Amino acid sequence: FERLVELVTMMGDQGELPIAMALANVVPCSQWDELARVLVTLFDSRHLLYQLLWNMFSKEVELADSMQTLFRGNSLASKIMTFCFKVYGATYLQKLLDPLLRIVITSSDWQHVSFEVDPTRLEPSESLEENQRNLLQMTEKFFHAIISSSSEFPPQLRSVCHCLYQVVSQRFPQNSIGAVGSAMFLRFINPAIVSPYEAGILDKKPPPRIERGLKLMSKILQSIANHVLFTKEEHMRPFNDFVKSNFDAARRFFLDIASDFISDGNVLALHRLLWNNQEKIGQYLRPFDKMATLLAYLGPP
Amino acid sequence: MTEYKLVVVGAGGVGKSALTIQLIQNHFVDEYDPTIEDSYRKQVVIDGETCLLDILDTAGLEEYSAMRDQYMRTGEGFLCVFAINNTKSFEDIHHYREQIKRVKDSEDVPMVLVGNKCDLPSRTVDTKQAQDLARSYGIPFIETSAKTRQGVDDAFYTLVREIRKHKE
Amino acid sequence: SYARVRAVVMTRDDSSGGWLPLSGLSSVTVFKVPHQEENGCADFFIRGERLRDKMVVLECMLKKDLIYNKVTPTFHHWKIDDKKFGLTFQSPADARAFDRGIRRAIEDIS
Numbered sequence: 001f002e003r004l005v006e007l008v009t010m011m012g013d014q015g016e017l018p019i020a021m022a023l024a025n026v027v028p029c030s031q032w033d034e035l036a037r038v039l040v041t042l043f044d045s046r047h048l049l050y051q052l053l054w055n056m057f058s059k060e061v062e063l064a065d066s067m068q069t070l071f072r073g074n075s076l077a078s079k080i081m082t083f084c085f086k087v088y089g090a091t092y093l094q095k096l097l098d099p100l101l102r103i104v105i106t107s108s109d110w111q112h113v114s115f116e117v118d119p120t121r122l123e124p125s126e127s128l129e130e131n132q133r134n135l136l137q138m139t140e141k142f143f144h145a146i147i148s149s150s151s152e153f154p155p156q157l158r159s160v161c162h163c164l165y166q167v168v169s170q171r172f173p174q175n176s177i178g179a180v181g182s183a184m185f186l187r188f189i190n191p192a193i194v195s196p197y198e199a200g201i202l203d204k205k206p207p208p209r210i211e212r213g214l215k216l217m218s219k220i221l222q223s224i225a226n227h228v229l230f231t232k233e234e235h236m237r238p239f240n241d242f243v244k245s246n247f248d249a250a251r252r253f254f255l256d257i258a259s260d261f262i263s264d265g266n267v268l269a270l271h272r273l274l275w276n277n278q279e280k281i282g283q284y285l286r287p288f289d290k291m292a293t294l295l296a297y298l299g300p301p
Numbered sequence: 302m303t304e305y306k307l308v309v310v311g312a313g314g315v316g317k318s319a320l321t322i323q324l325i326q327n328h329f330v331d332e333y334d335p336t337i338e339d340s341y342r343k344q345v346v347i348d349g350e351t352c353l354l355d356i357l358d359t360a361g362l363e364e365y366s367a368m369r370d371q372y373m374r375t376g377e378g379f380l381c382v383f384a385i386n387n388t389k390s391f392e393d394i395h396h397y398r399e400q401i402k403r404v405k406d407s408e409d410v411p412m413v414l415v416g417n418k419c420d421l422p423s424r425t426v427d428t429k430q431a432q433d434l435a436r437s438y439g440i441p442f443i444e445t446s447a448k449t450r451q452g453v454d455d456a457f458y459t460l461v462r463e464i465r466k467h468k469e
Numbered sequence: 470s471y472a473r474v475r476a477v478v479m480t481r482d483d484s485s486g487g488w489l490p491l492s493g494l495s496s497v498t499v500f501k502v503p504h505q506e507e508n509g510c511a512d513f514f515i516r517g518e519r520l521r522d523k524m525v526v527l528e529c530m531l532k533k534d535l536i537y538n539k540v541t542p543t544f545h546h547w548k549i550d551d552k553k554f555g556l557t558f559q560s561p562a563d564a565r566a567f568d569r570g571i572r573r574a575i576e577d578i579s
């Protein structure tokens with residue numbers, strides 16, 4: 001059939017992916033959310049995902065100025081990574097955080113469990129000291145549960161982190177594992193922790209006292225993953241001792257993840273992405289005639 | 302002292318935290334540490350009134366967009382920040398505006414358009430573009446550079462003034 | 470570095486049975502690379518590059534739970550994950566100076 005149009009997976013000699021990379025710099029930024037979905041879905045459907053991740057992650061690490069800026073923005077390469085975490089690890093993240101969130105909402109949120117640790121916002125009836133005790137108690141069991149999920153990590157996600165670990169290592173050999181665990185917590189775990197209902201983990205939004213706690217806990221969990229201390233908010237420094245003692249426990253989990261099975265796409269009319277950007281994929285530079293002849297037959301809807 | 306709840310929104314990497322830190326701590330943060338949600342407080346005198354500035358530093362990462370409903374619901378004025386070297390962030394302000402109006406259920410919500418990183422030689426959004434967009438919104442426009450601390454106070458001192466006019 | 474000896478690196482072929490050189494004598498070291506600040510937490514490694522061609526034939530990451538089997542003088546081996554690695558030394562004094570660096574590198578892991 002016309003399925004040769006889906007042969008965007010063509011790989012050039014001594015390199016790879018000419019059509020996708022050209023389409024990467026041409027497609028407008030507003031569609032990069034949709035673009036990261038169509039490439040991952042197609043390539044994984046043809047058992048070529050690793051070559052897709054190898055090309056996109058390489059372009060991001062060659063273009064970055066410092067290692068501290070890698071995959072911390074909303075670039076196309078960063079959206080492709082977040083989409084892979086979402087589609088291969090949502091089941092993993094759901095069943096890992098659901099029992100913990102059910103323990104905080106039900107059986108904990110009654111005796112005025114409060115995680116308010118900003119003294120400027122502390123209610124007079126509450127105590128800062130016991131509130132800090134609740135934040136670390138909740139943060140510890142959440143952190144321990146993530147480090148202890150090494151065996152239950154999906155293999156597809158384990159390959160994405162290994163690919164990300166190898167791509168960064170070819171320009172930042174020292175502590176290249178840091179960018180893996182940082183982006184993993186920043187763009188996959190913590191967004192679901194802050195907004196469990198929006199992530200589909202919970203049925204309804206947690207009570208307000210718990211939403212404030214999950215927000216502060218994700219800030220503590222992000223500092224642990226970043227291997228950095230709190231230095232901006234003064235009311236977060238009391239947690240630096242807890243954060244510093246959990247630095248290397250996160251790396252052992254990250255090193256485990258970065259070392260060492262889906263359906264097809266649904267009714268993907270890829271022409272729309274292909275034809276509504278058909279002017280400047282040819283200017284940008286050989287094979288465009290082969291697809292230009294393809295859609296000379298197949299008319300754009 | 303009357304409290305003014307300021308909220309800083311904008312795309313990721315435009316300088317929301319470097320502008321906020323230059324206001325609070327008066328030093329330029331050279332690192333790139335993406336924020337989930339930060340909070341600060343500062344006492345200042347504007348037009349002769351001593352007041353407290355409650356400041357929220359929000360997340361520019363679109364993964365944390367589910368939090369926007371809460372701080373748009375509690376904030377009084379919003380500092381709309383875009384980098385003058387990123388067209389995408391310049392157009393991203395529209396989607397922050399429309400959600401603020403939708404949550405406030407009002408078309409007159411006090412806010413200020415801020416074009417950060419003016420110290421850079423490679424401008425992508427020139428002054429006339431942002432000035433025309435600001436007139437379209439009906440809000441002021443301030444050019445800032447959190448590196449050299451240009452217009453940092455002016456940007457925050459303009460937003461409260463918009464809040465004052467809205468309260469009268 | 471915590472140690473720097475000249476020894477040949479051995480691997481264990483389960484079919485072959487026993488340890489064989491992994492083939493060239495190499496210079497083997499144990500060292501730390503710090504997380505962030507130099508005088509702070511770090512990762513510890515064993516690295517051996519052949520003098521034949523200055524290229525790595527073994528790189529291992531040390532653990533707190535690492536088992537270091539000192540079977541004979543001038544022969545030690547260990548197990549990391551699925552593979553088994555070991556070295557034979559040119560002198561027992563070299564086998565001791567290298568064992569001193571592995572013992573102290575584990576004590577600093579934290």
Ligand SMILES: Nc1nc2c(ncn2[C@@H]2O[C@H](COP(=O)(O)OP(=O)(O)NP(=O)(O)O)[C@@H](O)[C@H]2O)c(=O)[nH]1
Pocket residue numbers: 311312313314315316317318319320330331332333334335336337359360361362417418419420421445446447448449
């Ligand atoms: N040259 C220059 N760099 C700036 C300026 N403002 C911010 N930056 C740089 O922009 C990067 C990100 O700044 P940051 O304040 O973290 O941005 P953000 O808007 O908070 N991002 P996020 O939404 O994720 O929190 C850092 O490298 C910082 O040094 C500026 O005025 N000039």
Ligand SMILES: [Mg+2]
Pocket residue numbers: 317318334335336358359
């Ligand atoms: Mg920030």
Ligand SMILES: [Zn+2]
Pocket residue numbers: 227247248504510511
């Ligand atoms: Zn460390």
